[PDB]
Design a protein around this ligand. Structure first.
Ligand SMILES: Cc1cc2c(cc1C)N(C[C@H](O)[C@H](O)[C@H](O)COP(=O)(O)OP(=O)(O)OC[C@H]1O[C@@H](n3cnc4c(N)ncnc43)[C@H](O)[C@@H]1O)c1[nH]c(=O)[nH]c(=O)c1N2
Ligand SMILES: CCCCCCCCC
Length: 452
């Protein structure tokens, strides 16, 4: 078969792969990005389509504009399970036309010299002499099977992790996703019968019964159009997400016009710390394939962008040292853990605690304002549940006279702080990965056991 040589092969062109291509462009390298989808569909995986402005600012990434920006968001309304307490959290963000924005990023990367092949699937890794060395591709437009050799593969295949899962199972970058570390999620976009109230505010409904392990949402995409959906925890034996959706849609979106459904669909969403290493010999893994998603709220487009940025920085470093080993690419880990990964690890612990609370606990916590809106904001953006904030909360929790997991909040905060510091001490080279991973696994197991 035909053989081509590139410096970098990016497999997948969603927020993660497109970010990597954009960030790597015009830096002297010969880059190819492939995606199984036709051009006009790249970017269209089901999603709530909400991304903070702070994520774009973190990276100085261009804002969505024109038809890419369906609706400007000025904050979130968070609802207690009993619907009696609503916390309004202010902050700027965007409700995107995700395919349009994602396609605009790709078009700009292409304009800056990135080669992009759509309708093209990476079928098989080239793994030789202990390194990822490229991929066998199938290009549906040309009905050609081709081999592309690359110094580095950027695996950005989304939740399917379709390329890295075909690698030798002893490699650390083949790390699999436990069922309980992901949610399944489903959404629809519908027009509404009436103008949406406060259409610049997203609505998130906490309820352990109608969306066990996740939450329901109502995300306006304009004055009369909404993205509504839910996520539920995987691996718990829950019935189909579609049973919850049918049963409770009317509670959260009484105003949708069901005769005016525009799109619908679901996908898996990882909800955990990132891959223990996102780099290995000849390969970096980013976005959902590397578990980049916020474990508490399931937001992965902003962090997908961050992982793309870190991949680019690590690759440029590798070319400047001629070193495509895991050691040569290791700054990918150092970058990503400092930008977002350490926060994710802390939030992985926090999510485990939140998933085990009852509706009565959450109604009580929110009613009594056990933490303020300012502190919930600080905790979601940095991963920090300050010990003083946990103390103040525990002073309110001490006035509860029934058994509750809420009483463990201080212990949770301590475990969050511990895991965060462990991640901020991420191993400086691959020879230490094993030792450190065992310390993490130890923190997690101890923590899982502390909740009984
Ligand atoms: C229902 C629902 C709701 C939400 C969310 C998820 C879900 C399922 N999330 C998460 C967010 O959608 C997700 O984390 C990012 O879109 C993932 O971006 P990636 O680029 O990693 O994967 P993504 O899945 O977008 O892209 C991967 C690409 O790889 C291609 N591909 C896969 N295998 C391939 C192969 N072998 N060869 C070639 N191409 C291949 C695919 O065609 C695809 O285009 C979210 N996040 C958020 O920020 N805001 C939100 O509101 C929500 N809400
Ligand atoms: C202000 C907008 C913040 C982005 C919301 C992300 C949560 C989506 C799963």
């Amino acid at each position: 078969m035909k053989e081509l040589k590139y410096d970098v092969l990016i497999i997948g062109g969603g927020f993660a792969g497109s970010s990597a291509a954009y960030q790597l462009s015009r830096r002297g390298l010969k880059i190819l990005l492939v995606d199984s989808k036709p051009w006009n569909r790249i970017g269209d995986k089901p999603c709530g389509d909400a991304v903070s402005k702070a994520h774009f600012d973190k990276l100085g990434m261009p804002y969505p504009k024109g038809e890419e920006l369906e609706n400007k968001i000025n904050g979130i309304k968070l609802y207690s399970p009993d619907m009696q307490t609503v916390w309004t959290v202010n902050g700027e963000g965007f409700e995107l036309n995700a395919p349009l924005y994602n396609q605009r990023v790709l078009k700009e990367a292409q304009d800056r010299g990135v080669e992009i092949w759509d309708l093209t699937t990476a079928m098989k890794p080239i793994f030789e002499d202990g390194y990822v060395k490229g991929a066998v591709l199938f290009n549906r437009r040309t009905n050609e099977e081709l081999t592309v050799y690359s110094k580095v593969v950027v695996e950005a295949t989304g939740y399917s992790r379709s390329f890295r899962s075909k690698l030798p199972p002893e490699l650390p970058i083949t790390e699999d996703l436990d069922d309980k570390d992901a949610d399944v999620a489903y959404r629809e976009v519908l027009l509404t019968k009436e103008d949406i109230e406060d259409h610049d505010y997203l609505r998130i409904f906490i309820d352990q019964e109608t969306s066990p392990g996740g939450y329901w949402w109502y995300f306006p995409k304009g004055k009369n159009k909404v993205n509504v959906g839910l996520g539920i925890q995987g691996g718990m034996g829950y019935p189909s997400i579609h049973e919850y959706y049918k049963k409770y849609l009317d509670k959260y979106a009484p105003d949708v016009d069901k005769s005016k459904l525009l799109v619908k669909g679901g996908a898996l969403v990882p909800t955990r710390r990132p891959l223990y290493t996102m780099a290995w010999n000849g390969i970096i893994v980013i976005g959902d394939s590397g578990f980049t998603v916020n474990p508490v709220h399931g937001g992965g487009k902003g962090s997908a962008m961050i992982s793309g940025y870190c991949a680019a920085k690590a690759i440029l470093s590798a070319f400047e040292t001629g070193d495509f080993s895991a050691s040569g690419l290791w700054d990918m880990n150092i970058c990503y853990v400092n930008e977002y990964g350490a926060k994710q690890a802390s939030l992985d612990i926090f999510r485990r605690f939140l998933q085990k609370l009852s509706n009565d606990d959450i109604n009580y916590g929110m009613k009594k304002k056990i933490i303020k809106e300012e502190d919930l904001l600080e905790a979601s953006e940095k991963g920090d549940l300050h010990l003083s904030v946990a103390d103040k909360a525990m002073r309110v929790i001490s006035g509860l006279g029934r058994p509750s997991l809420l009483f463990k909040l201080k212990a949770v905060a301590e475990s969050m702080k511990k895991i965060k510091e462990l991640y901020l001490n991420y191993p400086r080279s691959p020879s230490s990965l094993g030792s450190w991973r065992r310390e993490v696994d130890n923190v997690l197991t101890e923590f899982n056991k502390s909740l009984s």
